[PDB]
Amino acid sequence: CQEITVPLCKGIGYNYTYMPNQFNHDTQDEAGLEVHQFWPLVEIQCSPDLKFFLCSMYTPICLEDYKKPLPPCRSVCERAKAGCAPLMRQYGFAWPDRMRCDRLPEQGNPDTLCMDAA
Amino acid sequence: AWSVNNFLMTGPKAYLTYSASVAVGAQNGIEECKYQFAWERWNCPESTLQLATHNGLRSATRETSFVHAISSAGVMYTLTRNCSMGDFDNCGCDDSRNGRIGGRGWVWGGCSDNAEFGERISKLFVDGLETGQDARALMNLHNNEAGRLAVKETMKRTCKCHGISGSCSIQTCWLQLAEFRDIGNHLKIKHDQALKLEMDKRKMPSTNSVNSRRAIADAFSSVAGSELIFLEDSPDYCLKNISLGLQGTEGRECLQSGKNLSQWERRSCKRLCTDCGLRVEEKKTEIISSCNCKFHWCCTVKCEQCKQVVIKHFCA
Amino acid sequence: PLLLYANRRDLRLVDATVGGLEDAAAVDFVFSHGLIYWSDVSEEAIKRTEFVQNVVVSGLLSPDGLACDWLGEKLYWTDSETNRIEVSNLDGSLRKVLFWQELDQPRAIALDPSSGFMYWTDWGEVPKIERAGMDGSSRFIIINSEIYWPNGLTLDYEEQKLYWADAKLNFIHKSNLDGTNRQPFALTLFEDILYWTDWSTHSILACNKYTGEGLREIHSDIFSPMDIHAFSQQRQPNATNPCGIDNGGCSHLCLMSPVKPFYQCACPTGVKLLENGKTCKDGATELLLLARRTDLRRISLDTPDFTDIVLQLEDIRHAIAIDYDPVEGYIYWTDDEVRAIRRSFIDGSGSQFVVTAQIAHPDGIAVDWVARNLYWTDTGTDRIEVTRLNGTMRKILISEDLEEPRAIVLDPMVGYMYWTDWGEIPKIERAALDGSDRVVLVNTSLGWPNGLALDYDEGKIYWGDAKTDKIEVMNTDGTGRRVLVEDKIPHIFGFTLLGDYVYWTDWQRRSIERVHKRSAEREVIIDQLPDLMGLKATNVHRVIGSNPCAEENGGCSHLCLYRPQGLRCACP
């Protein structure tokens, strides 16, 4: 575990993250340098979930009781894409292929455990 | 002064400090050999110590070639990764070819593992321990180099895409070790397909060896530097033979029932037990696998446990 | 004071404010002549340069000590790998190994001309500082108590004291021969300042050389300091040479001595000194030739040191047998790779080819020293051929009923030729020198007969057998068969007899053992030398006997073959 160092992800839901991340980053600063390219889309606040999904993906949570990775559920990703995606595509920004939502576990499975609201 | 002219003092040294890492490598190799043969009649019944004593694998069987190879590859891999990591100054790793442009839209870089360092040390120690001049020692040397270059050849260019917003348009690449699993599978195949050496009946008269010998093994050394070399046929692994360190097949776990078990593993119970005459005895108890997990909303991940029945049989 | 230190690829001087080499280990100087000598432990050499030249190259393994004698003009060195100390003239000539026994890993060496003493250290399990005479007299261990990894031995000629450091105990001691004061590899002195080099600081630490106070630093960043000395004329006090005008009448080496005229006449390696005590014999009179797989070497049997000077020969690939004719002084050896026989002198000069043609497995060669002929056997082609010593007039002398022939020998004064055979039925045979009267002398209890010796003096023949691992003795006709020794026998066996001893090769062909042909005493003569194949002990001077062939080749146009019943001429 390490401590969240990226501004946008402080107080996103967890204070502890691991490295390397799902994006294969050395330091938290490296993951922040990449997630910062979304800052426009963040300021627009095109989706409330976008910040949580992108922060669970670039600096995933690190827990001292659960040592298996914990990704956001597929619905959170599909919701951030549903809300944010139309503007970015309309301006030529594809939902990033690493961020694809069919690559994530779905909520409601003890085997596929994820983070979401009920 | 770890890296010095190495003639008088300090230099010519630096052999004991590495022996631990080398032993760890050979242990990883032995564990992988045990993995590759987990459900076969020969299941890599080898210790780390034994590959120095040569006791328990003096049989120039198909499986000893693989054992030699996989242990040389394990030692080389482990010491190459020790060197490559910073535990030993990263040895400034494979700095050659770094920075150049390797293709359209990607460049070399990162810290490529200094494989030639690991190979150098592994040769220095492992081939030293391979004492004797007989044909079997040449076979073992062959299989050793076979595993060292199996570890080397398996190195692959791994990359990280550092383009705009993460696009793989531009990316930095380095040369990384492969997964130890793929090397284990490779040596598994090499064991399944090891081959016996010359086995020549004529053997040019060598009662006195000053002129005889030292040429026989010379002609028996045209063997694939990837392939493992063995001379004797492999014994029957159904049977116990305490002279060879073979503990027999009785009492060995096999896999009978299994959702996703290899036909090899599913047949393993008949092959080790039923094909060898022994009977199949079971175990009352059952295993457990976490289940009923309830990832609380936000911040907390909490997962409950479940219980399930494992399957296996014992050639009792 | 200038400070000269062996870097490793460099040699350079420091003050009070040559490159391109691989692992320099030693350095010294002769200030009067402006000379600088250095040792390379990797190059296995000692060279010289003035203020490059080869000085000692003829065979080091790890030479760590090197000191130039300015009064007797001699160079002393120690080789830590080969465990031996050698001396030579100032230009490299007349090289002499002073010590070799009871030496572990001889490192640093030092000499004391005015006193006529040398000194050196041992870095073995029993590290020590020991001195001896500059002529290798009376090896004496001086310091043995409490030292480990000792280095930087230094003598103070100004105060008759001996200093040293301890690269393991981080001390610098001083003594003289006995009394020892403690004050770190090599060290030197200049005026007031004792400078040392710290195994773990890579800097030139400095202190007072009388007291020690002032542990100053002279030069930092010096990573490799294998040695340090003071380069000064005042570092080599003048005295007259007791040898005087011309080596004090010594024909060869005039070495400093502690006793008597303070000079001692010496002779180069192997050669013996005549009753004169001033005139050497003309070289060593013996040659015990040894055919290894890739070299050819000689061992004198006159002196107990048994030192194998390597012959300076090119392209030896699979030598087997060697021998030497004393009458003309020609050495003939065979090469299983070149598939040929070569000639040459003890020096190795005048190397010539004798036979190049139809040879496969030439398992036997024989010099005729009376009639001046040459016989050889070929296990490949299964025939005994004969030429002259020139190598011309080659003639097939025996071909039928001989299979896998190996050792061949001749008795010119009687007229008999005995050889061994393998193949379908192994045997030891004897014939007259023209192949006539081919008769089998030993028939049974033979497997793979490997070697045959003749005792010309006492009418005896000796043989050994690869398959039966036995060496047997027998009379040259009226049998008296007896197995002299029971031991494993190398396929290719260097076997020879001369005098009261018998020379043979061990199973691994790594060593030559001897057995006292008379008694039974077995002493291993040469060891640790693999791929031994063949041997012929011989007296380079002494030539015993003659036969009618000895006059005008017995009137034969080619081969003079002597029978006991007469003599027959032969043709190519």
Numbering used by the authors:
A (entry chain A): 35 to 152
B (entry chain B): 23 to 338
C (entry chain C): 21 to 37, 47 to 80, 86 to 217, 227 to 615
What does the paper behind this entry write?
To initiate signaling, Wnt simultaneously engages the extracellular cysteine-rich domain (CRD) of a seven-transmembrane receptor Frizzled (Fzd) and an extracellular domain (ECD) of the coreceptors LRP5 or LRP6. However, these binary complexes lacked LRP5/6 that interact with Wnt through their ECD consisting of four Tyr-Trp-Thr-Asp (YWTD) β-propellers flanked by epidermal growth factor (EGF)-like domains. The structure of the ternary haXWnt8–mFzd8CRD–hLRP6E1E2 complex resolves the basis for coreceptor binding by Wnts, revealing a modular determinant that not only controls LRP5/6 domain specificity, but also appears to differentiate the non-canonical Wnt5a and explain its coreceptor independence.
The peak fractions corresponding to the 1:1:1 haXWnt8–mFzd8CRD–hLRP6E1E2 complex were subjected to cryo-EM analysis. Two-dimensional (2D) class averages of the complex revealed the central Wnt bridging the small globular mFzd8CRD and the tandem β-propellers of hLRP6E1E2. Three-dimensional (3D) reconstruction yielded the 3.8 Å nominal resolution map, revealing the stereotypical Wnt–FzdCRD binding mode as previously reported. hLRP6E1E2 appears to “cap” XWnt8 at the top of the structure by engaging two sites on XWnt8 distal from the Fzd binding site. Site A is formed by the XWnt8 N-terminal loop, and Site B is formed by the linker between N- and C-terminal domains (NC-linker), which insert into the E1 and E2 funnels in the center of the hLRP6E1E2 β-propellers, respectively. Both binding motifs in XWnt8 were not resolved in the previously reported XWnt8–mFzd8CRD crystal structure, suggesting they are disordered in the absence of LRP6. The flexibility of the unusual interaction mode seen has presumably limited the quality of our cryo-EM map, precluding the placement of amino acid side chains for the XWnt8 N terminus and NC-linker. While the N-terminal interaction is particularly tenuous, the NC-linker mainchain clearly shows that the central region of the loop inserts into the funnel. We find that deleting the hydrophobic N-terminal loop (XWnt8ΔN) reduced LRP6 binding similar to XWnt8ΔNC. Since the effect was less pronounced than deleting the NC-linker, the NC-linker clearly plays the major role in driving the Wnt–LRP6 association.
